[PDB]
C-alpha cells in the first residue's frame, strides 16, 4: 500500500485525496517515469498475493 | 545536593515514559488510514517504543485522528477521562485541529481541543505517516523537557 | 465472463484420501504457514531509519504554504482573491488596498491551517504562482493558535523555502 | 520449611510490588476517570446481571471426567504390581467406559452449545 | 492589601464545598482511619459552608459591579451546621459508617504533627485542626453573596455531587432524596 | 540484496518461492528521481480555423428531459433481456 | 565461507567511523551504524551519505549536526534542522545534490535556516495584520460648554 | 474505458465469509491483470477536455 | 520539437504474472506416516 | 544459603521475562518485515527497562464499581503462583525436589485460572465478566486432556518425579516414542498460557483487553509478568518432558546451558506461532480438545498402559 500510496503523490502531491480526477479528465498528465515504476510494481505483486 | 538527585530523578522519569509511549488504539477517519501507515513496515512505530493497546486503562497518548462529530465527543472525552495518568493528546489533521474540510458543519465539533487538552497538533488533510512521526517525536521532546520533580524539590 | 472462486470437488481415491488424513492429523498446511513466517524472518525489512532517512516524495508534494516574490523581491500576489474564491475549505482571508506607491497589493492574507485541507487548489488558481504548497510537511505545533497563519508568516515561509520551491516549480512546470 | 519459605517470598514480594504501584504514583481521582469502561459509552445494565453459559452440560461433564483422572494418575504405581492380569483388565476398563460415556455424550449431542 | 490598593475588593469565604475541596472530601477521606475524632465531638463549633460556584459567580459580579471597588464581602452559605452534623450528613450522603469519637485538643494537635512529617501534600496538620473547629464567623455589617446577586446554593443539592464517588459499588446509585438533611442552627 | 547465499537459500526453501526474483524492496530498477523535461500534446480544439465554438459546444446540445406522458400493442421491457455470462477461457474454477 | 566474509564487513564498520568511539557515537546517536559515501555537508554541520546498494528509502541520510543555531543536538535532532536545499536532495525529489545543482541565489532568501521553533519563546504568534477600521471622535481637550 | 479491457468476475457458490474473501483476493488478481493493459494500451494525447 | 510524454516503451511491456501459484511440495500421505510409524517404534526399542 | 538460593531463582526470572517481551517484539516485528524496537538502548536492549519503569509510575486506578479486595488480590496471586511453577523445576537440580512434582505443576496452574476469573469477576464491567468466563470455557476445554496426556508419558517415566524425566531420557528423547502426545501437548500448553491462537480471555480484536480491562498501570504489569512467566515454565516443562537433556554429575553447568538452549527456541515458537495463524472461536478450541484430542489421547492412554507391560519395559518405581 505504502508503494501505491507514492503513485498516488507523484501524479497529484498526495498520498491520499489526491483531488486528481476531475469532470473533465485528470488534472495533470503522469509525470515521465511513472509507467515504468507502475509496471515494475505490477510485476511482483501476484506473488505477495500468494503470500497472502 | 538534592537539586542534583531531582535532576537525574526527573530525567530518569522522562526517559521511561517518552520511551514507552502507548497510543490508545483509536481513530475516527481518514486520518486513521495515515496512522495505520506509521505502524507499517516502512516507519515502524512500534521501533521508538511506540505499541497501540486498546484499553484506556493501559494507554499514554490519545491520537485524534480524524473528524469528531457531536454525536461522537461525549464518548471522545470519556475515553480521554478514562486514561490514568499522565496522560497526552496528539490532534491528527485538519479536522481534528479545527474543523477542517467540516469546520462549517453543525454536527461537527470545531477542533477536539474544545473537548479534551491537545499537547501537539499535527497539520495536514492528512498528514503523511512520517508528519505524524514527527509529531510523535515532537511529544516525546515535549516529556524529555519535563521538570516534574524540581519543580516539586522547590515548591 | 466470470469464474468460480470455490466450486471443487476432491478426489475420492485412496491416495487422496490418506493425503488429507495426514493432512489433518500431521498439520501439514499450518507447517506450511509456518515457512512462510520463516522466510520473513530472514529477508531485509522494510524499515527506514527516520528522521535520518526520509519517505520519497516528488516535486508535486502539497505541503506547508507560501508566498513567493519576483527575483526583485517584489511580492507576486496581487490581490485578486482567486484562490480565496476556490478555497474549498474557505481557509484563506484576504484583504487589500492600494499600497503606497500605488501598487495593488495585500493587507491581509491569513491561512487558517487547521481548516485548510491541502488540496491545493490555491496555487493552480493563483495567475502569478504567489501562493504555493511547499514540500515542507514537519511544521506541527503545540498550539492551535500557531497554525493560524497571518501575512508575515506566509513570506517568511516562502523566504524561508524559496530555494526548493523554485528548483520544485521548475521541475513540474511544465505539467501545468 | 523450605517450601513454606518459597511461597511466602513469592506472595511477598508480588504484595511488594503492589505496594508500590499504589504508593509511588501520583494520583487524580475523580468520578468519570473511574466509570466502568465500555468503549466510551455508559454501561445498560449492571455487569452482574445473569450471564447465560451455553456449554452448561459440558462444564458438567467436566466434572465427571476430571475425576477420572483421579482415578487414572494412579497407573504408573499399579504397573509395579505383581498382579498385572488383574490391573491391566481393570486398566483398560476403567478407560474404554470413559471413552464409552465420551462416545454417549457426543452422539446425544451433548457437547453442542445450546443455541 | 487594603493599605497597598485601597480599591480592591477583599472576598471573605467560609469553608468552601465543591468537587475538588479539601472540606468535603476531607471528612469523607476520615474513613481510613476508622472512627471520625471530633474535638468536643464536634458539638462546640459551627459552620457556614458556600459552594465553589457561588464564591466564583460573587468574584466574577465583582469585577463588573462599579460598587464592590473598596468593598469588603463575605461569602457564606444559606445555613449553619454543628460540625458534628455536618460530619454526620457527609457519612450519610456518602452511606459509610460514623464512629465519632471524642479527641482532646492537645492528642488532635499531636496526631496532626505526625501527618506534618510528610515532605508531599499533607493528610492533615495541626493548623488544618484548627481550622475546621473554628467557629464560622457572623458578620452582618459585611455585604455578602445577595449584594453581588447571587444566590446561596444550599449543601442539601450538591452534597451528592461532591460525595457519590466516595461511596461503594453498593451505594452509587443512591438518589439524592434519600438521605435526610443535617440539622440546621435556626 | 545483500543477503548471503546460505540465507536466500534458507528463505527460498521456508517459502517454496524463488523470492530472490521479485523482491518487494527496491533497487535500481525504478525511474530515476530527475528527469528530462516534458513537451505535452495539445486537444483537438487547438486549431486556428474550422473550430467555431459553436459547432463544439457539449453544454449547449442538452436539452429538457422528453415528456412522454403528462396529465397536464405488444408488451415491452426496459430494455432487450441480459445475455447470460459465459465462463471464462483463462481459468473458468479457482 | 560467506558468515566469515560478514564479520569482517561488520568488524569494517568500525574502522569506517574512524574508531571504536566513532563508531559507538553514530550507533547511539542514529541508531545505524552502516558507512556511506560523503555527498555533502551543509554550513551547520550536517553530514549527507549514499550508498545506491541499499534499497530505495535506505540509500540517503543525513547525520545531524551536533549544534544548530546555538541549541545543543547530540540528543535531540529532528527533521526540521535540513535545510531547503539539502531537503530536495534527502526526500529524493531530486537526483542532484547542491553540491552539483546549488540552488539559484536570491537576496531574500535566509542565509540561516531555522529549525521548529513551536514550544519556544521564537515561536509564531498570530496576529492581525490590519489597521483600525473606524476611527473614533476625540473630544476637545478645554471647557466650552 | 472498461469495455476495452479483459478480466473476469470471481463468484461464489456459497454465501458465506470464505466466498466473499476469495472473490476480493481474485479481484486483485485480476485488477493486476487490468493494469496490465492499461499499461500497454495508453494512448497519447491531452488528459482533460480541449473546452476551456 | 517532438510531443513528450509518458508512454508505453515501444514493444509494451514485459509479461505479468497474476494467476494464483500456490506450488505443490511435501512427500505423500503414505510416506509421512510411514516414518511417523517407524520412529514409534525405534522409540518403543 | 536457601533465601538466595530463592533470589537467585525469581529475579533472573524476572529479568528473563522483561528481555522476553523485548524479543517477542523483534522477533513478531522480522516476520512482519519491520524491526521492532531498536532506539530505546542499542538494538533496543533497554527498551524493556523502560517499559517496567513507566507502568510502576504510572496512576493505577480502582474502579468505582469495583471489589476492591477481589481486584488487589487477583494480580497478586497471578505472579505470586507464577514464580511458585519454578521452584520444582530440575535445572538440572531443583529448588525443591518434590515427589509428586508434575502433580504440584498442574495443582499450581489450576489454582492460577482463579487470578484471572477474580480479576474478571471483581472488576465488575462487561468486557471483563466475558475475558473471564472464556477462561471457564478454556480451563474446561485443555485440563482433561492435559493430565492424561502427561499420564501417558509418565508410564515410560515411572514417576512424577520432575527429576526421574532425566534418568528416563538418558539415551534417547520422549519426543521418539511420544511424539504423538508432544504435538498434543505442545497446543495444550499454548492454551493453558492463553497463547495465540487461543489468546481468548484477552482477545483484544473482540473483547478490547478482555480480563484485564480495567487494570493499568503496576497491577497491569503483575498479569503481563505472570503471563510472560508461564510462557517460559511451560516450554521449559515441555524441554524436560521431551528433549530431556543428559545431566553430567560433575558438570552441571553443561546440562544447564544445553537444557537452556531448548528452552529458548521452544520459547521462540511460541512467538512464531503468535505471528502465523488466526484466532480460534472459544467454542471450536472446546470441540477440537474434545472431539479430537480427547479421544485419540484416551487412545494413546490405553496404549502406553499397555505397551511397557507387553513389551516388559515397564520403568522402575524408584
Ligand atoms: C543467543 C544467540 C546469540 C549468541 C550468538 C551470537 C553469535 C554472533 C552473532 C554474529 C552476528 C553479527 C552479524 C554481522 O557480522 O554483522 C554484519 C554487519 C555488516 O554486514 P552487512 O553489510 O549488514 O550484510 C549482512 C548480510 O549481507 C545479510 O544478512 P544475512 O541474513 O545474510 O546474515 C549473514 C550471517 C549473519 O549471521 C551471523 O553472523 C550470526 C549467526 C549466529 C546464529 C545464532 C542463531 O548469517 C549467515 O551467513 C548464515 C549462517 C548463520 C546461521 C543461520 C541459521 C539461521 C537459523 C536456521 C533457520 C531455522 C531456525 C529455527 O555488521 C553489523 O551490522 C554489526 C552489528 C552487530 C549486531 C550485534 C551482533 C551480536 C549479536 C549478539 C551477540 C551475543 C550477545
Ligand atoms: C495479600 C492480600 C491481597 C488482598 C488485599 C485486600 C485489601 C485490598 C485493599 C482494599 O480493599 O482497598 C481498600 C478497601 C477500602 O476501600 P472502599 O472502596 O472504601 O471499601 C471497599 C469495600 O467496602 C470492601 O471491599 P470488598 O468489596 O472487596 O469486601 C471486603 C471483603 C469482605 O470482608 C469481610 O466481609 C469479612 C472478612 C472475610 C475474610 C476472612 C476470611 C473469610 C473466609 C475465607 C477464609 C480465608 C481466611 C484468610 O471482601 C473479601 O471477601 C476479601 C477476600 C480476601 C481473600 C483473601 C485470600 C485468603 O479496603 C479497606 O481499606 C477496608
Ligand atoms: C533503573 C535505571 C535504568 C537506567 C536507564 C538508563 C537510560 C539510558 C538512556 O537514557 O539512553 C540514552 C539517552 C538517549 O538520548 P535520547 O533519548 O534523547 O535520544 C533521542 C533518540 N535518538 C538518539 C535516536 C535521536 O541519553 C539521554 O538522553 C540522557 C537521559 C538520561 C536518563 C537519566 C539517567 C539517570
Ligand atoms: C518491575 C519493578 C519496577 C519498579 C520501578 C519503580 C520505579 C523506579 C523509578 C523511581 C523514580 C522515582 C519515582 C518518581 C515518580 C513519582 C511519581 C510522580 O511523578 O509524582 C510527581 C510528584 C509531583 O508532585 P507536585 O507537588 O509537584 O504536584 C502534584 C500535585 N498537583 C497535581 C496539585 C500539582 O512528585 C512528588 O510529589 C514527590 C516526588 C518524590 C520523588 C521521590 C520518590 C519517593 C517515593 C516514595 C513515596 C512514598 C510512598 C512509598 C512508595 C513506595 C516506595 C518505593
Ligand atoms: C505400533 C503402533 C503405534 C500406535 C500409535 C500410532 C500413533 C500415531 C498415529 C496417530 C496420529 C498421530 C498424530 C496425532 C496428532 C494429533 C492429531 C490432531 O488431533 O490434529 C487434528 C486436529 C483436527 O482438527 P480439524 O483439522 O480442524 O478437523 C477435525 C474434524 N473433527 O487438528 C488440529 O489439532 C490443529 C491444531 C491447530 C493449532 C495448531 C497451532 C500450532 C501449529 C504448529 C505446531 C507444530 C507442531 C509442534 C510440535 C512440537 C512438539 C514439541
Ligand atoms: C486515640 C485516637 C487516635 C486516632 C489517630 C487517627 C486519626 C486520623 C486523623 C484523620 C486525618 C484526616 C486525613 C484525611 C485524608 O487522609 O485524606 C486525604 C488523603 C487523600 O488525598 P487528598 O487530600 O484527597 O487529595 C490529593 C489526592 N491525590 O489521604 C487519604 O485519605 C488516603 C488514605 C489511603 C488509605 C490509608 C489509610
Ligand atoms: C484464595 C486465595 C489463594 C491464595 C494462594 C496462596 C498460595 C497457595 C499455595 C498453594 C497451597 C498448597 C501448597 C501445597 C504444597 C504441596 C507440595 C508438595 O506436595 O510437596 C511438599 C513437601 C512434600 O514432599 P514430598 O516430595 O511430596 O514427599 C516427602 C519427601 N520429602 O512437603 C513440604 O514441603 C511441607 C509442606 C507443609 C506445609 C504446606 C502448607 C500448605 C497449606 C496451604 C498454604
Ligand atoms: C516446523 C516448525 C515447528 C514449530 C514447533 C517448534 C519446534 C521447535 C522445537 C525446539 C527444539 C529443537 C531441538 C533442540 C536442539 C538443541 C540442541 C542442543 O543444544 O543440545 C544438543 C542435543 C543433544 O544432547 P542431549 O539432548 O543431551 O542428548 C539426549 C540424551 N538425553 O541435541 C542434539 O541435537
Ligand atoms: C465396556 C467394558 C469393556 C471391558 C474391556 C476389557 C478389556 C480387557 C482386554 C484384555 C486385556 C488383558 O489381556 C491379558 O493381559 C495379561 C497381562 O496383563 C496377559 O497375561 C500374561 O502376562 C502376565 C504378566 O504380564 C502373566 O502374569 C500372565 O501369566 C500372562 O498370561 C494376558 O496374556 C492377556 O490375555
Ligand atoms: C477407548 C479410547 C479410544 C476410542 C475413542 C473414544 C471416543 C469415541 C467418540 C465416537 C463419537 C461417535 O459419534 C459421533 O456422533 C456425531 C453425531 O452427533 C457424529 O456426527 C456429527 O459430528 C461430526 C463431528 O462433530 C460432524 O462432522 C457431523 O457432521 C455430525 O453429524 C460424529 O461424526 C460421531 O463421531
Ligand atoms: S483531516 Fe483530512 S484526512 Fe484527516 S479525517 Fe479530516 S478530511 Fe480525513
Ligand atoms: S490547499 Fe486547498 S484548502 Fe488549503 S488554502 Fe489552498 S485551496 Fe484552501
Ligand atoms: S495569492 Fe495569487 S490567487 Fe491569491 S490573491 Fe494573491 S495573486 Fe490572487
Known amino acids: 500500500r505504502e508503494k501505491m500510496f507514492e503513485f498516488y503523490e507523484r501524479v497529484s502531491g498526495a498520498r491520499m485525496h489526491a483531488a486528481y480526477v476531475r469532470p473533465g479528465g485528470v488534472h495533470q498528465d503522469l509525470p515521465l517515469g511513472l509507467m515504468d515504476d507502475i509496471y515494475e510494481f505490477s510485476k511482483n505483486f501476484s506473488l505477495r498475493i500468494d503470500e497472502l | ?155 | ?176 | ?115 | 492589601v487594603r493599605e497597598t490598593f485601597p480599591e480592591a475588593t477583599i472576598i471573605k469565604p467560609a469553608e468552601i464545598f465543591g468537587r475538588e475541596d479539601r472540606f468535603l472530601n476531607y471528612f469523607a477521606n476520615i474513613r481510613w482511619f476508622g472512627g471520625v475524632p471530633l474535638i468536643s465531638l464536634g458539638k462546640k463549633t459551627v459552620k457556614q459552608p458556600v459552594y465553589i460556584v457561588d464564591v466564583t459567580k460573587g468574584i466574577i459580579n465583582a469585577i463588573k459591579d462599579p460598587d464592590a471597588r473598596g468593598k469588603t464581602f463575605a461569602f457564606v452559605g444559606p445555613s449553619r451546621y454543628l460540625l458534628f452534623d455536618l460530619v454526620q450528613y457527609v457519612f450519610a450522603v456518602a452511606h459509610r459508617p460514623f464512629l465519632p469519637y471524642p479527641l482532646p485538643h492537645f492528642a488532635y494537635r499531636w496526631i496532626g504533627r505526625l501527618f506534618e512529617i510528610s515532605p508531599f501534600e499533607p493528610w492533615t496538620t495541626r493548623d488544618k485542626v484548627e481550622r475546621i473547629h473554628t467557629t464560622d464567623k457572623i458578620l452582618p455589617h459585611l455585604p455578602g453573596l445577595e449584594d453581588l446577586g447571587v444566590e446561596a446554593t444550599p449543601l442539601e443539592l450538591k452534597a451528592i455531587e461532591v460525595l457519590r464517588r466516595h461511596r461503594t459499588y453498593r451505594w452509587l446509585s443512591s438518589e439524592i432524596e434519600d438521605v435526610q438533611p443535617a440539622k440546621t442552627i435556626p | ?94 | 565461507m560467506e558468515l566469515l566474509q560478514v564479520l569482517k564487513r561488520g568488524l569494517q564498520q568500525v574502522s569506517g567511523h574512524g574508531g571504536l568511539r566513532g563508531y559507538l557515537r553514530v550507533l547511539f546517536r542514529a541508531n545505524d551504524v552502516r558507512v556511506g559515501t560523503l555527498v555533502g555537508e551543509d554550513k551547520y554541520g550536517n553530514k549527507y551519505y549514499e550508498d545506491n546498494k541499499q534499497f530505495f528509502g535506505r540509500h540517503r541520510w543525513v547525520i545531524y549536526t551536533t549544534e544548530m543555531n546555538g541549541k545543543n543536538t547530540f540528543w535531540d535532532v529532528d527533521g526540521s534542522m535540513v535545510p531547503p536545499e539539502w531537503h530536495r536532495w534527502l526526500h529524493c525529489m531530486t537526483d542532484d545534490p547542491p553540491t552539483v545543482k546549488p540552488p539559484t541565489a536570491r537576496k531574500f532568501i535566509w542565509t540561516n535556516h531555522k529549525f521548529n521553533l513551536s514550544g519556544t519563546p521564537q515561536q509564531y504568534v498570530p496576529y492581525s495584520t490590519t489597521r483600525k477600521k473606524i476611527q473614533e471622535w476625540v473630544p476637545p481637550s478645554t471647557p466650552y460648554k | ?52 | ?45 | ?318
Open chain 2, 1 to 155: 545536593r538534592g537539586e542534583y538527585v531531582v535532576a537525574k530523578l526527573d530525567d530518569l522519569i522522562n526517559w521511561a515514559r517518552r520511551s514507552s509511549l502507548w497510543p490508545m488504539t483509536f481513530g475516527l477517519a481518514c486520518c486513521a488510514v495515515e496512522m495505520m501507515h506509521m505502524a507499517a513496515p516502512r516507519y515502524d512505530m512500534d521501533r521508538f517504543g511506540v505499541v497501540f493497546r486498546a484499553s484506556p486503562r493501559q494507554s499514554d497518548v490519545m491520537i485524534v485522528a480524524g473528524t469528531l462529530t457531536n454525536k461522537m465527543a461525549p464518548a471522545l472525552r470519556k475515553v480521554y477521562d478514562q486514561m490514568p495518568e499522565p496522560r497526552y493528546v496528539v490532534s491528527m489533521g485538519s479536522c481534528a485541529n479545527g474543523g477542517g474540510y467540516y469546520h462549517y458543519s453543525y454536527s461537527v465539533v470545531r477542533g477536539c481541543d474544545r473537548i479534551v487538552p491537545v499537547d501537539i497538533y499535527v497539520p495536514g488533510c492528512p498528514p503523511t505517516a512520517e508528519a505524524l512521526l514527527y509529531g510523535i517525536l515532537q511529544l516525546q521532546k515535549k516529556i524529555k523537557r519535563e521538570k516534574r520533580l524540581r519543580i516539586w524539590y522547590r515548591r
Open chain 8, 1 to 52: 474505458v472498461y469495455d476495452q479491457v479483459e478480466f473476469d468476475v470471481p463468484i461464489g457458490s456459497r454465501g458465506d465469509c470464505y466466498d466473499r474473501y476469495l472473490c476480493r483476493v481474485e479481484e486483485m488478481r485480476q485488477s493486476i491483470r487490468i493494469i496490465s493493459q492499461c499499461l500497454n494500451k495508453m494512448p497519447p494525447g491531452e488528459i482533460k477536455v480541449d473546452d476551456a
Open chain 9, 1 to 45: 520539437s517532438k510531443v513528450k510524454q509518458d508512454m508505453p516503451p515501444v514493444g509494451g511491456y514485459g509479461p505479468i504474472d497474476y494467476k494464483r501459484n500456490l506450488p505443490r511440495r511435501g512427500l505423500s500421505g503414505y510416506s509421512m506416516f510411514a516414518v511417523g510409524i517407524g520412529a514409534l517404534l525405534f522409540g518403543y526399542w
Open chain 10, 1 to 318: 544459603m536457601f533465601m538466595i538460593n530463592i533470589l537467585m531463582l525469581i529475579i533472573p526470572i524476572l529479568l528473563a521475562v522483561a528481555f522476553l517481551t523485548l524479543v517477542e517484539r523483534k522477533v513478531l516485528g522480522y516476520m512482519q518485515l519491520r524491526k521492532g524496537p531498536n532506539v530505546v538502548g542499542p538494538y533496543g536492549l533497554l527498551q524493556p527497562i523502560a517499559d517496567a519503569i513507566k507502568l510502576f509510575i504510572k496512576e493505577p486506578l480502582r474502579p468505582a464499581t469495583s471489589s476492591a479486595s477481589m481486584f488487589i488480590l487477583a494480580p497478586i496471586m497471578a505472579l505470586g503462583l507464577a514464580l511458585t511453577m519454578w521452584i520444582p523445576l530440575p535445572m538440572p537440580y531443583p529448588l525443591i525436589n518434590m515427589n509428586l512434582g508434575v502433580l504440584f505443576m498442574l495443582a499450581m496452574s489450576s489454582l492460577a485460572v482463579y487470578s484471572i476469573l477474580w480479576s474478571g469477576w471483581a472488576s465488575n464491567s462487561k468486557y471483563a465478566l466475558i475475558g473471564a468466563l472464556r477462561a471457564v470455557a478454556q480451563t474446561i476445554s485443555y485440563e482433561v486432556t492435559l493430565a492424561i496426556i502427561l499420564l501417558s508419558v509418565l508410564l515410560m517415566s515411572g514417576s512424577f518425579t520432575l527429576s526421574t524425566l532425566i534418568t528416563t531420557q538418558e539415551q534417547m528423547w520422549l519426543i521418539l516414542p511420544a511424539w504423538p502426545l508432544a504435538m498434543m501437548w505442545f497446543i495444550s500448553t499454548l492454551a493453558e498460557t492463553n497463547r495465540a491462537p487461543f489468546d481468548l480471555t484477552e482477545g483484544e480484536s473482540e473483547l478490547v483487553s478482555g480480563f484485564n480491562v480495567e487494570y493499568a498501570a503496576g497491577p497491569f504489569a503483575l498479569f503481563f509478568m505472570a503471563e510472560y512467566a508461564n510462557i517460559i515454565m511451560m516450554n521449559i516443562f515441555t524441554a524436560i518432558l521431551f528433549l530431556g537433556t543428559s545431566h553430567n554429575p560433575h558438570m552441571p553447568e553443561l546440562y544447564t546451558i544445553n537444557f537452556t538452549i531448548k528452552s529458548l527456541l521452544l520459547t521462540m515458537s511460541f512467538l512464531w506461532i503468535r505471528a502465523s495463524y488466526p484466532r480460534f472461536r472459544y467454542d471450536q478450541l472446546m470441540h477440537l480438545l474434545w472431539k479430537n484430542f480427547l479421544p485419540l489421547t484416551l487412545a494413546l492412554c490405553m496404549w502406553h498402559v499397555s505397551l511397557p507391560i507387553l513389551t516388559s519395559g515397564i520403568p522402575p518405581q524408584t
Open chain 6, 1 to 94: 540484496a545483500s543477503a548471503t547465499r546460505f540465507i536466500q537459500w534458507l528463505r527460498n526453501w521456508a517459502s517454496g518461492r524463488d523470492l530472490q526474483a521479485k523482491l518487494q524492496l527496491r533497487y535500481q530498477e525504478i525511474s530515476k528521481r530527475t528527469q528530462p523535461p516534458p513537451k505535452l500534446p495539445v486537444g483537438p480544439s487547438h486549431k486556428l480555423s474550422n473550430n467555431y465554438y459553436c459547432t463544439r459546444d457539449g453544454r449547449r446540445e442538452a436539452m429538457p428531459p422528453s415528456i412522454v406522458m403528462s396529465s397536464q400493442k405488444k408488451a415491452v421491457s426496459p430494455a432487450p433481456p441480459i445475455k447470460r455470462w459465459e465462463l471464462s477461457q483463462d481459468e473458468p474454477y479457482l
Open chain 3, 1 to 176: 465472463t466470470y469464474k468460480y472462486v470455490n466450486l471443487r470437488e476432491p478426489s475420492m481415491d485412496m491416495k487422496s484420501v490418506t493425503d488429507r488424513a495426514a493432512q489433518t492429523l500431521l498439520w501439514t498446511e499450518l507447517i506450511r504457514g509456518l515457512g512462510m513466517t520463516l522466510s520473513y524472518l530472514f529477508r531485509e525489512p522494510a524499515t527506514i531509519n527516520y528522521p535520518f532517512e526520509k519517505g520519497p516524495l516528488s516535486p508535486r508534494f502539497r505541503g506547508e504554504h507560501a508566498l513567493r516574490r519576483y527575483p526583485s523581491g517584489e511580492e507576486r500576489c496581487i490581490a485578486c482573491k482567486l484562490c480565496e474564491a476556490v478555497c474549498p475549505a474557505q481557509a484563506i482571508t484576504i484583504e487589500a488596498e492600494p499600497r503606497a506607491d500605488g501598487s495593488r497589493r495585500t493587507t491581509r492574507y491569513d491561512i487558517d491551517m487547521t481548516k485548510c485541507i491541502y488540496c491545493g487548489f490555491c496555487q493552480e488558481a493563483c495567475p502569478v504562482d504567489a501562493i504555493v504548497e511547499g514540500p515542507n510537511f514537519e511544521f506541527s505545533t503545540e498550539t492551535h493558535e500557531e497554525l493560524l497563519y497571518n501575512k508575515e508568516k506566509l513570506l517568511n515561509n516562502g523566504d524561508k523555502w524559496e530555494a526548493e520551491i523554485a528548483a520544485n516549480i521548475q521541475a513540474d512546470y511544465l505539467y501545468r
Open chain 4, 1 to 115: 520449611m523450605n517450601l513454606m519459605l518459597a511461597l511466602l517470598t513469592n506472595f511477598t514480594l508480588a504484595t511488594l510490588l503492589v505496594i508500590i504501584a499504589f504508593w509511588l504514583p501520583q494520583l487524580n481521582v475523580y468520578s468519570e476517570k473511574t466509570s466502568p469502561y465500555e468503549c466510551g459509552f455508559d454501561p445498560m445494565g449492571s455487569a452482574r446481571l445473569p450471564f447465560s453459559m451455553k456449554f452448561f452440560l459440558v462444564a458438567i461433564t467436566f466434572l465427571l471426567f476430571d475425576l477420572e483422572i483421579a482415578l487414572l494418575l494412579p497407573l504408573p504405581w499399579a504397573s509395579q504390581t505383581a498382579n498385572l492380569n488383574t490391573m491391566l483388565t481393570m486398566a483398560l476398563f476403567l478407560i474404554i467406559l470413559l471413552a464409552v460415556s465420551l462416545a454417549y455424550e457426543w452422539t446425544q449431542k451433548g457437547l453442542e452449545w445450546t443455541e
